[PDB]
Design a binder for this molecule. Structure first.
Ligand SMILES: *CC(=O)N1CCN(C(=O)c2ccc(C)cc2)CC1
Ligand SMILES: *CC(=O)N1CCN(C(=O)c2ccc(C)cc2)CC1
Lengths: 304, 304
């Protein structure tokens, strides 16, 4: 019993983190096989960041200008290329600690663990969600860029995020491991405003299911609703619309608890309309939306 | 910028987790040097748990009855002893992945990371606090016992907790790594009620400082108070009394923000008296008390 914001064990990713220095900028790199992945803005002066031409900046850089350090041992860079907003540095040594891995581009609402790193060394791990506006709310200081987000399926690390940017609003933007930004963001120190940060409805429902499983039930009501009726209320409260796909994904939690998805929707509706009245659910006074249905099943079943 | 409930990177601890089986009970063990530490109730039948005499139960057990598996390789048990509520199994192989480590007994209010494990395999990591009533609010299923809590200071893992027990209220009880329970709890399936779960005042203040550092300031007021006046309000709201020791520990956060500790106390006082009025601080609608002053300095400075 008990339900916690739970990150993946980070060890597999800890074994991939390196320091990348180009001139005066030190960032984090991800070492998989004989390739080190890092944000391309490693090549920028602070001045460069205001309006960089990465292709032009990169011409002035050689293999030997990229200083790659894994623990306190230097890696020999034998190649470099730019793919979208990441650099791939080819090194002469396969990372011996390379886990089985994949690069995945996640959808808004999907959760992942971040291994926050500084100078190629892990400081902490926490759980995030890709917001519907393609920002994440992280904990990232200067030097944290190149820190990665990931999921694990038993033995296979799926890398989904690399940290590149803090917006003036102190929310975070980054790329998948092909160097494509989530959302409309660019690796330039220019005013970029985030869109509406809507609540991830399917994640709130999964977390209400988690609450019932863990004994928090005060919010279960006598009502049901329809997808259309629920969606009118969701719109009004800046909740993402719920689709039949979401209902299908919640099926297993519905089955385990015996609470029809649309009944839980009606409970969420009354909570939106009535508030919490000073009460808590799983130690929270607001509706949590950074647990996926899969996250709730995993934590409630004890997958390793 | 951004402030997250952050766990230590778990890799150093992942390398210490083993499976312990005695008869039909499988739990987790911690392998440090040539010793495996596990909850002594590994030797109990479900029947035994109602009123076990551990010394008497242990007489019926030999080295070869303790099945210790690290990954998919069996360890040879060459000795066993009971220390308080833990077993120490001597094995013929030093754990090659043994980190620098210490056993520490933490105080109420202190935070730590839990590596939740099942069958010696990591499922997740999350951040906890020893509650003032010596429970923790964890996420622990059957098979999770022997999972450990820890802090890291650069290279040295300080183990502070081993999981043993869920109370009928679905809160958690365990031991330090000498096998001494936190609080008055016993490893017996009997009614044990937790005391008052008071709010860790010094931790709420540290987190209000973290909020100011991260730009959340709406709650800063025009008022100050005294330790005595603040403490009258704390008592009324089931907050732990604040001592000069707590004020001293908050000194660095006071210095960085330029907000006198007693001014922040007056802000916390108005929040207690007035509530949040539907507003949030660092994405929370209640006052968070599972960040220590040290935790706030660490996360805000990016220690590795
Ligand atoms: C993403 C990241 O970690 N970066 C990029 C932004 N950044 C700076 O431009 C910067 C340069 C120098 C100093 C003192 C602070 C910030 C920090 C690194
Ligand atoms: C602490 C822990 O993980 N335990 C101890 C309590 N426990 C049981 O007694 C138990 C036995 C058998 C079954 C099916 C469930 C629970 C679980 C293990």
């Amino acid at each position: 019993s008990g339900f916690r914001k739970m990150a993946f064990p980070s060890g597999k990713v800890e074994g991939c983190m390196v320091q990348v220095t180009c001139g005066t900028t030190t960032l984090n790199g991800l070492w998989l096989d004989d390739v080190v992945y890092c944000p391309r803005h490693v090549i920028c002066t602070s001045e460069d960041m205001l309006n960089p031409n990465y292709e032009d900046l990169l011409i002035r850089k050689s293999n030997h200008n990229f200083l790659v350090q894994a623990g306190n041992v230097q890696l020999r860079v034998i190649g470099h290329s730019m793919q979208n907003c990441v650099l791939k540095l080819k090194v002469d040594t396969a990372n011996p600690k390379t886990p089985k891995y994949k690069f995945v581009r996640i959808q808004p609402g999907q959760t992942f663990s971040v291994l926050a790193c500084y100078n190629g060394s892990p400081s902490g791990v926490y759980q995030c969600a890709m917001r519907p506006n393609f920002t994440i709310k992280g904990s990232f200081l200067n030097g944290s860029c190149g820190s990665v987000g990931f999921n694990i399926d038993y033995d296979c690390v799926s890398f989904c995020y690399m940290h590149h940017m803090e917006l003036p609003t102190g929310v975070h933007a980054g790329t998948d491991l092909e160097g494509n930004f989530y959302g409309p963001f660019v690796d330039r120190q220019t005013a970029q405003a985030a869109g509406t940060d809507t609540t991830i409805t399917v994640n709130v429902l999964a977390w209400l299911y988690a609450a019932v499983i863990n004994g928090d039930r005060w919010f279960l009501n006598r009502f049901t609703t329809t997808l259309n009726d629920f969606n009118l209320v969701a719109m009004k409260y800046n909740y993402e619309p719920l689709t039949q796909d979401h209902v299908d994904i919640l099926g297993p939690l519905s089955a385990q608890t015996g609470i029809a998805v649309l009944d839980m929707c009606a409970s969420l509706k009354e909570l939106l309309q009535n508030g919490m009245n000073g009460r808590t659910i799983l130690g929270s006074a607001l509706l949590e939306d950074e647990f996926t249905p899969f996250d709730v099943v995993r934590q409630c079943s004890g997958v390793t």
